[PDB]
Structure 1
């Protein structure tokens, strides 16, 4: 009934072993206290008892000089990534460029590379969708926008905000580690595991410098991702403003047409009032006259036209 961790252990030779271990047993094996493996923070990287404990959203990892541990890897679609890349990356000719460096360098490089790839994939999924939605929405020949595309844009904007928050947290953690040389020195766990051995093992190679360079590379990649996401958000805001202006302009055009038609209808009704008054079933002295009917019809139509033209001219003067 005790809580357990689903642990995937990658050895220094790339061998992978998956099992389940009691939390107390894991603490005893790793020489860590219970508070060290709480993983309470959304993303964090810490060095406790010469062990690199890190969490990035759903990825919880513990790096020791002997091996790497992935915790709570189930129901996250991580099996493909783990069993297809990590044996190759840690113990092969993969994209990792820190192979001659100790195991922790390869481990942290692989973890940061996977996380940066996940963020870049999220951005590369979001960008075309947002771009095409904005292009459809800011189309100047549409009187009104599509509301389903508006909802899609809202969902994509929420996803982009979440991605920006994730990238900002990544950058903040990496920069906080890079700022202090003490954290960089602590990150070299293999160096501090046997300081006497590494006093002569390091033949002029600085582990702290290599860690600083790797973290700087990943921080620069995260900064590029953040810049791209910020540009996307700015473009979204500009497109929203353009949509507002387009809708207002269409409303103004429709209102102008409606006002002109209202002027025409008002003139027609104004002279139809005279027509109806002459059409009442009341006795008058103009029934005997013959040209009176045609004269009234002609003056009604001509006056309606003239009043409509005068009202249009007045509208043009008012709108300058």
Structure 2
């Protein structure tokens, strides 16, 4: 079966149509070729035969002087935007300005929503992790943080490509003149308006990129602080363990002393209890003094 395109068409007045059409018929209707309607690039804005071709991550659009076409809209939850919002926007400037503004605004709003969803989750996770009241931290939250960081990196890449394309178009004026397809087809400055639009969207994308970068550096700083806190807790607990081990060693030493003096043999000292009491007292007090002196020695270090 020959491949087909599921297209939805918007007119100047805002009227909407939807259908499916063969690629060859689409090429014949327009002045394009299969080389153009291939959509091999993640982000692209191009002009061919007075027709504008735009592609986002998943949005494919063709703009003509008298109509707009969205291709492959099925299974992408675009119905609300297509059948409820776009007609209002499209209903003195030409059609190209309105269409380009609508598409760019949609993409920018999508990116803003992504960032606004990502920010609070990361902030809450970092606030929970940095809490110095716990010697350990949860790991499910760490996995969540990793996934959200991956999503943030993808968002940063998308913003970067958006800005790159917009700036590449802005620098040259030939492309700016090309975007005015209506005047070329059927011959106030259009160039100024297009420059204003592109500059506005470029600045918005730059703001988003700065916010994402700030979030990433915050993540890194939080990771470093987490490392420091864990190391400090380790050192505290090891100090306590050493302090207890000193006492254990002293106790074992004097227990060996007592055991050796208390063998089941003859020592010529079983007829006196004063010696026994003296040994008990001296062993206990010496345990105490040795423990204290070892504590002081550790403190000296």
Interval of TM-score (by shorter of Structure 1 and Structure 2): over 0.9
3-state DSSP of counterpart to 1:37 = coil
- Following superposition, the deviation at residue 187 of structure 1 comes to 1.2
- Following superposition, the deviation at residue 285 of structure 1 comes to 1.6
3-state DSSP of counterpart to 1:34 = coil
Report the equivalent of 2:71: 71
- Following superposition, the deviation at residue 165 of structure 1 comes to 0.7
Structure 1: distance between partners of 2:266 and 2:112:
89
Report the equivalent of 1:94: none
3-state DSSP of counterpart to 2:268 = coil
Structure 2: distance between partners of 1:269 and 1:298:
16
Aligned-residue CA RMSD (Å):
0.9
- Following superposition, the deviation at residue 35 of structure 1 comes to 1.2
Structure 2: distance between partners of 1:30 and 1:311:
92
Q: Normalization by structure 1: what TM-score?
A: 0.92
Q: Normalization by structure 2: what TM-score?
A: 0.98
- Following superposition, the deviation at residue 82 of structure 1 comes to 1.0
**Which runs of 5 or more structure 2 residues have no equivalent in the other structure?**
none
- Following superposition, the deviation at residue 280 of structure 1 comes to 2.2
Structure 2: distance between partners of 1:263 and 1:30:
89
Structure 2: distance between partners of 1:103 and 1:160:
35
Structure 2: distance between partners of 1:135 and 1:58:
35
1:229-269: CA deviations, max 9, x gaps?
00000101111111111111111111111111111111111
- Following superposition, the deviation at residue 279 of structure 1 comes to 2.7
Moved over 2 A (4+): none
Structure 2: distance between partners of 1:219 and 1:299:
84
3-state DSSP of counterpart to 1:5 = strand
2:291 pairs with one of 308, 311, 317: 308
1:82-111: CA deviations, max 9, x gaps?
1111011111xxxxxxxx211010000000
3-state DSSP of counterpart to 1:274 = helix
Which has the larger displacement, 280-289 or 176-185?
280-289
1:32-77: CA deviations, max 9, x gaps?
1101111101111111111110111011111111111111101111
1:249-304: CA deviations, max 9, x gaps?
11111111111111111111111111221232222122112112111111111111
- Following superposition, the deviation at residue 188 of structure 1 comes to 1.4
Aligned residue-pair number: 301
Structure 1: distance between partners of 2:28 and 2:294:
92
**Which runs of 5 or more structure 1 residues have no equivalent in the other structure?**
92-99, 196-204
Which has the larger displacement, 300-309 or 113-122?
300-309
3-state DSSP of counterpart to 2:79 = helix
Structure 1: distance between partners of 2:160 and 2:97:
23
3-state DSSP of counterpart to 2:265 = coil
3-state DSSP of counterpart to 2:110 = helix
3-state DSSP of counterpart to 1:35 = coil
- Following superposition, the deviation at residue 305 of structure 1 comes to 1.1
Structure 1: distance between partners of 2:89 and 2:264:
101
- Following superposition, the deviation at residue 182 of structure 1 comes to 1.1
Which has the larger displacement, 178-187 or 116-125?
178-187
3-state DSSP of counterpart to 2:217 = helix
- Following superposition, the deviation at residue 157 of structure 1 comes to 0.5
